[PDB]
Amino acid sequence: MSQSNRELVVDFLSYKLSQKGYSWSQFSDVEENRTEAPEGTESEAVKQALREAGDEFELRYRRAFSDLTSQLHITPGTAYQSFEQVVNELFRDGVNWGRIVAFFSFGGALCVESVDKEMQVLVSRIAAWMATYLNDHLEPWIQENGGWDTFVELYG
């Protein structure tokens, strides 16, 4: 339900694309209705805790996650199935906040791999694929576990 799930997905994607030298403002389609990116207060605190959690894991495991994105298909059609079956496996040990750190970090790296392959138009679709999964499976577990506001109090 909550549109904030997409707003915090856009931020860590757009930052990873900016570190590769790319521009989200050129890839973005059309603005929807209301509310902006996480630059305020409590949503900016989620973003900050989540960014350090991704950045430390990317230092220690750059090789592992780059080899994991190399086998995953990212083109429309088969990718929507190829992503689902792999994400349903990485949460199979538990739906915990530690596996949510891996889920977002993998999705952000897949978006980069698409732009780097000259498939920049998919930045909108790959972001929707992970945000739709996050609404379909994680959102009720996230709210039962105190929301992203609890994640920043645990990991910030």
Binding site: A53, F57, Y61, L68, Q71, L90, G98
Partner: peptide, 25 residues
């Protein structure tokens, strides 16, 4: 583990399991 046509287990049973040394974040 050996390879299967449905899942690259020889590679993925490494990368997913290799992360054991950090409980994320």
């Amino acid at each position: 583990g050996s390879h299967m046509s449905a899942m690259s287990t020889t590679d993925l049973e490494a990368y997913f399991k290799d992360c054991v040394f950090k409980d994320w974040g």
